[PDB]
Design a protein around this ligand. Sequence first.
Ligand SMILES: O=C([O-])C(O)C(=O)[O-]
Ligand SMILES: O=C([O-])C(O)C(=O)[O-]
Ligand SMILES: O=C([O-])C(O)C(=O)[O-]
Ligand SMILES: O=C([O-])C(O)C(=O)[O-]
Ligand SMILES: O=C([O-])C(O)C(=O)[O-]
Ligand SMILES: [Mg+2]
Ligand SMILES: [Mg+2]
Ligand SMILES: [Mg+2]
Ligand SMILES: [Mg+2]
Ligand SMILES: [Mg+2]
Lengths: 357, 357, 357, 357, 357
Amino acid sequence: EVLITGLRTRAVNVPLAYPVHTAVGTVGTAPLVLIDLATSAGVVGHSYLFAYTPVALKSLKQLLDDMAAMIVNEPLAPVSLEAMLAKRFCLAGYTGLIRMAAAGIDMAAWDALGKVHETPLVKLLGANARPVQAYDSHSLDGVKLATERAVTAAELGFRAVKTKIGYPALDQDLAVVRSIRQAVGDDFGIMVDYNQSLDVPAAIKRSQALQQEGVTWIEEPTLQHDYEGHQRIQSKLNVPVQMGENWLGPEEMFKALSIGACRLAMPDAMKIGGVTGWIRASALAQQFGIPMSSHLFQEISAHLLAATPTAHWLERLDLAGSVIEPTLTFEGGNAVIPDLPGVGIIWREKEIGKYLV
Amino acid sequence: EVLITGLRTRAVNVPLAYPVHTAVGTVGTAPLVLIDLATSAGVVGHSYLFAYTPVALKSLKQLLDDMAAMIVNEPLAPVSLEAMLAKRFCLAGYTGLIRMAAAGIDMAAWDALGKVHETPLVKLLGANARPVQAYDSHSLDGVKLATERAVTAAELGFRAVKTKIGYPALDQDLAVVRSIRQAVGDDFGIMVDYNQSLDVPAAIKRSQALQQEGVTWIEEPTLQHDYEGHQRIQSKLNVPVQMGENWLGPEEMFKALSIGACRLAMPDAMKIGGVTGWIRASALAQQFGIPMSSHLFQEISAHLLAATPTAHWLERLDLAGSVIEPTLTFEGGNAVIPDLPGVGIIWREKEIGKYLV
Amino acid sequence: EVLITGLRTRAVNVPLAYPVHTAVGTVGTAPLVLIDLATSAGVVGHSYLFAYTPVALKSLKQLLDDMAAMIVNEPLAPVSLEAMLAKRFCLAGYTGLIRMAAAGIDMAAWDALGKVHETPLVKLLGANARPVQAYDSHSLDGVKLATERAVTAAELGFRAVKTKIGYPALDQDLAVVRSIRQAVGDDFGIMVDYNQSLDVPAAIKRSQALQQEGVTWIEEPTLQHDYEGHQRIQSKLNVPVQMGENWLGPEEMFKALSIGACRLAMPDAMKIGGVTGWIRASALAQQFGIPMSSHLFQEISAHLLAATPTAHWLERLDLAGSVIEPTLTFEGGNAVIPDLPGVGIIWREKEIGKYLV
Amino acid sequence: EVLITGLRTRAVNVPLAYPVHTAVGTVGTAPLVLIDLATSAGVVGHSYLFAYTPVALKSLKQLLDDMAAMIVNEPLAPVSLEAMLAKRFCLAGYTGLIRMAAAGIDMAAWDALGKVHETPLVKLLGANARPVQAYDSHSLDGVKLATERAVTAAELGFRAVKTKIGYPALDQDLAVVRSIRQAVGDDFGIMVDYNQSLDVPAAIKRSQALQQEGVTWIEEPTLQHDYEGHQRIQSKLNVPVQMGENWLGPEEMFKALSIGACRLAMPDAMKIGGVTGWIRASALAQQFGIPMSSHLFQEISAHLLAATPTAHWLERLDLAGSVIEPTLTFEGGNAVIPDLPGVGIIWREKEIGKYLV
Amino acid sequence: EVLITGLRTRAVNVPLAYPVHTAVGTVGTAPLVLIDLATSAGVVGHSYLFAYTPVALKSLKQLLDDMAAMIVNEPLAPVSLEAMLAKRFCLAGYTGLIRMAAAGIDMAAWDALGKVHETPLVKLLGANARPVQAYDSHSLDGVKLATERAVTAAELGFRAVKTKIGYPALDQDLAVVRSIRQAVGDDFGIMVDYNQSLDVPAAIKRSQALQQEGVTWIEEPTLQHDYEGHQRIQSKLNVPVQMGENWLGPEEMFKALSIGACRLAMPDAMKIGGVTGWIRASALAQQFGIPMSSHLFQEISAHLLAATPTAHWLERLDLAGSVIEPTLTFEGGNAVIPDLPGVGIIWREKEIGKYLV
Ligand SMILES: O=C([O-])C(O)C(=O)[O-]
Ligand SMILES: O=C([O-])C(O)C(=O)[O-]
Ligand SMILES: O=C([O-])C(O)C(=O)[O-]
Ligand SMILES: O=C([O-])C(O)C(=O)[O-]
Ligand SMILES: O=C([O-])C(O)C(=O)[O-]
Ligand SMILES: [Mg+2]
Ligand SMILES: [Mg+2]
Ligand SMILES: [Mg+2]
Ligand SMILES: [Mg+2]
Ligand SMILES: [Mg+2]
């Protein structure tokens, strides 16, 4: 009985705090698609998608625009909407850009549903808000900048940071981790992210060296789809292998956990299938005994982690801060959900116009 | 913010329409614990528990009354409440009667949350109401009564019935199924339930003979906890093995599905862990590719199945109709969710007094 | 040395000979993206993509146009180009629409390389042209039309047809297959396609009944990504399960074959990763002992199957005949590769204008 | 339409730089069979076989001579030729000397096909030439000569060397590795090769000792056909076990990788089945996540590795330098493919006459 | 002490009684290498090899002649000689033609050792002579000839025959088996041989149809090296899959039995590694519970089967009768070992001259 009455998309290329350098390439600004889902109840649901590369940005906006035909005049019932989209895209492939688009709709539909009920999303999911520990996510920064960023994060109350590694030599990876460690002390988390950049033997060699140094987890050591390879790496380590940012739907998470690819998981709220997909992922992580963190999407992930039985860490990487009001706050390194209906995303309407593509 | 302010229980032994004879003993009236969860918002959540045998009825009410103090003044946040109860009962064993008591609290809490938002439970879960196909659940009735009840059900619009089997002779099981089939035709479901009454070899022999007759599924052929034995029985059959009414929590479901015990599942809304546990179960059934039906608890199961990705059948077995208003209806053999906030359970307050233990 | 100098795409919605009705919806005209790859040698490579639904058509063209800048000035070396694209799209997700776009580039690049060498693609791959047996692919046509089309195909020299099944009743599936079989005899192939429309238990029941009738294979009985479910269905059948049209890349094929999902494979030249991906797939099918057929893309698949060690059947389903010259012919039910350089695709330039979106 | 018009073989015993001592025996000169495949296009394909021991040299030449009857007047289509030979030798056993002969034909046929198209082989395979890192392959040289050969290699720009080990005592293996390491520094690869000389327990003991020293890989620790044994050794190591030089066809590689025998592979261009076999192997190594190096045959392996998705190292061991012009060069320790049609093998016709058998 | 003093080989192409037509080509006369092993005790060991195709005949003789120098002056100790040859050929590959050559040496060495001790080979192995049941091995003969030969064999006292199948149509396979069965009755063995001619799905379909007819075993349904495929075929059958004639060494047998490829085995005395290899094989067949028959080599196989714990059938297919005296006899369908020292092979010296290549 509340119906969707409109879908609007805006493509933007927005400025970050610091360019996200990785072992496989740099992201400087962020290409986002901002989504507004109008309803018969007046309220408007807000979400956004991350396109990764500007090469996919227009394509992703166009796909969503064409997908409006499937959702306008449908009831605002995200679980029912998701089943419908899965069926309509059965042939095309309910994965990749299509799935990402479907997840943007889901996230905006749950924001609207929270607004219909004048309640924060975390409460609509049946949970209480609580503070959620966050790590500050950095990049392939070199020794000097990595160490500076770590010090600043520790000063702000974060109890962990993540750096991106996969320099040409193992010794360069180790020099960065060692430098951070000396600056932040032993009682501090140092997560490291390979961004898929190693083959299995190289990953075993580098990871056993990092384990000796002392790191909190080793993220995506090899090609993301190679769950068997991740299992073989994890088999040679005490430190946990972390992955999951690239899982497209809970069905891909299921395949990975079924063969023991990793001891930690970190679904992406977009790629996993939005709120609907996230809650399903949550249930899998619980049964498989996997502590579950987030990947990007810090605004909605604060809510979702509060409803996740094995919640572990929130990834602080603020891609959309230039266009979303800072209603999510951090106190003592913990994310603090705002007391606002739905997700608590309010657009900075005058800023968005600066960045439209 | 909205808080639980009180808990009241009433233990009743209520009359059914027809004693539930099984191969392992018969349930002639139903022992129930009726639950009222008061809240700071003025609304009262309603749920009930089934104690199976009167021997466990007073014990279950006593347990719930002694749990009032742990939930009074807690937020009405069913997911957060479930986590607290799991932790409190870590030592005692969060299973059996304790888990059943937790599930009754969960179901009444979700009823109350629907009421707080003035919305049916199905919509609060993010799904649309839809009619759900139901089968009429009968008992170890003999050829004459079994065939009469089947015809009556078909007359009323049901497209399937379940009968309880496990007579002293296989020939008797087959005689009942044949006489039903003659009276209802080939385009009709006949589910059969062994209620754990056979050892593995006996189950293989009886089930392959039933399979030749044409039945829709074979339910609980052996001891419910023996997942490996259910796997061995399934390995010898084309017809699906059905089980799950006795899983205490989604963790037991996960263990059974992980070894291939069955090709169908039917969780019990109480034993699975209420709404919270059911939603977890539904995620598991989706990933493992298992069509998921309900067991008893028809009032809440109509809502839950509408939010279940692999929803299969609703079991119609009306245990509580003597004390709950008939707001759930059946049309054309489909359950129709009432348009009422929460679950739509309203007590028949003048009838309850008759049945107090 | 030979370089790509440009990329042009045209999005069309083209008329078929007969709408493709499936159990999960119907494809009434075909949305295609036509690709022209210009090179420094003067020759132009041609390929096309199938977008399945018009909803994805503009998005796919947009994506390819935004990929021009990454391939312009690169060498015309399809293997090296594929590696570059895999790396560039590591973060976004090298799957779904992105992977499909990469595959269209690959197919046009191999067409261009054949042209550079003035040699049919089959010979450039190191194989001899040979006729390849083809089946004529029909749709959810009903008893009358299905039987007519089967007779017509048999009259024309085809030795097999495929029909789409998954009618509301199993009896209807069986009625269609029986009426075909009566019209064509026992010495004729009848493949059947469920287009992912059944859950595992339903697929076991329907498939064992079809198996009694005599069918050649059962294609995509359940959700395409559910390899474990396809294994469970295959485990109950003598007839081969066929799948693979929905594998995105050889890595998905490898996962499916590694767990015994099917006893036949049919990769899609676009989803498998073009020629580059097809040749990989062919190596896998050889080792796993899986006879390998094609899915759509008949123009290029005739070349590719001639270089496939376990080549089985070519699927005749002419999606692009309204815009491509009929240089591929069929004689005695066998596809005959034209003696033209590259793939032998030549555009009907005056027809394309009619169908532009 | 280009046909094979002749096959010529020449058996030679040619001089090496240094005798190849192994733990299982010494190779001084090299017994080779030189193969010329004449064609209707005028061009002549060149390849060679390595016979390992002079005991097999005449046999291998005679077999090829008798195999001429199967290939003369056939089309120059290596993939089609390979399928034909596999069928004709189905009964005899398409392995061993037979398979080696078939691979010599394949390698010469692809050289001819490159020549027909006036293009280097790497380009005909769809890839770009790039430099490929090479290690210099030495022998069971003792401490003094091993150290001298390593120093000379490092001076020439090689970044790794391989020594052959399996001296009577483990301490002798370790003394050689230690001496090299001191001479070349920590940032240098030291590969070691056992040449099948240890049983599994001895291999676990010696390899864990070598791992402590620091080596790059441990090659063929036990009997080559014992894939289970290799798996058991690899299970006790962090350092990768390398094998594959003895795989006769991709089918043997498949069997080894299916059970986890090794974390690195190094097919032999002859034994694996030539170019055709190599490309199939390439596809397997990619899926199984195995970095893939070459074994001998440096001339063609430079081409092949440039088309191998998981390319790792080229083995520099110049068996045929006395009879093939040095068109393959090494710059900075990288092999540099010559810009010549086909493989770039040109016979030293006046030298061949010195070495004929 | 007793030493080998010389080796002589003669390559012959000998006439059979009836060309051996198979689904994969036909063997019209037999190419054999006849072996004479001279010793310091005055006695000469005799054996022969089968080269399958004349293409390999000269190569095999050449190889053996070039192996004379490695065995001359070695002790006549077949086990110690086999170990030496395995080590010498470690690099070349102790398989295929090389392994076959080693096996001919082994068989002639055991013949010589029987002669040294003046005792039949069976007694030297520690067993008693006994008659061994034999089947008469026929070819792809057609309904008329197949049925004639079956009757002739039954008339002579054989209790089973083998026919070669794999005609273009399954109906033809079935027509041949039915016409045999009609002519010989139900109390008679009909073995069928596919000679590797079918892919796995084709083999499942053909074999289940043959199984309905009643056959004794199904031999080599698919590619001989594909043990996993033979397992998949066996998994669908009640009738036993038979294989093993193509195992090169007991190590290949071990790999096949380890994965459940077959429920019967039939090693070839030459390919399995002669007497030495056969005795190893017999130990494996015993442990794995596999009834073990012979393949060709009837003269020596009668001795070997008498020492085989799970001895099943001797294959009567007399390849060498044109050049070996008929000292092996058949009575009542059983092979009778002659009372002669060693194997009982005596050359027809005046006939050999007729058949020299
Ligand atoms: O931050 C991450 O974990 C990831 O590497 C990303 O940047 O998308
Ligand atoms: O619980 C029951 O009464 C029975 O086992 C059922 O399935 O309905
Ligand atoms: O894609 C299709 O239209 C169908 O599934 C087929 O197999 O042809
Ligand atoms: O060099 C090698 O890797 C191998 O041992 C050989 O010499 O053939
Ligand atoms: O080798 C053969 O001729 C045949 O395969 C047999 O079993 O006899
Ligand atoms: Mg990451
Ligand atoms: Mg029951
Ligand atoms: Mg299909
Ligand atoms: Mg080596
Ligand atoms: Mg045979």
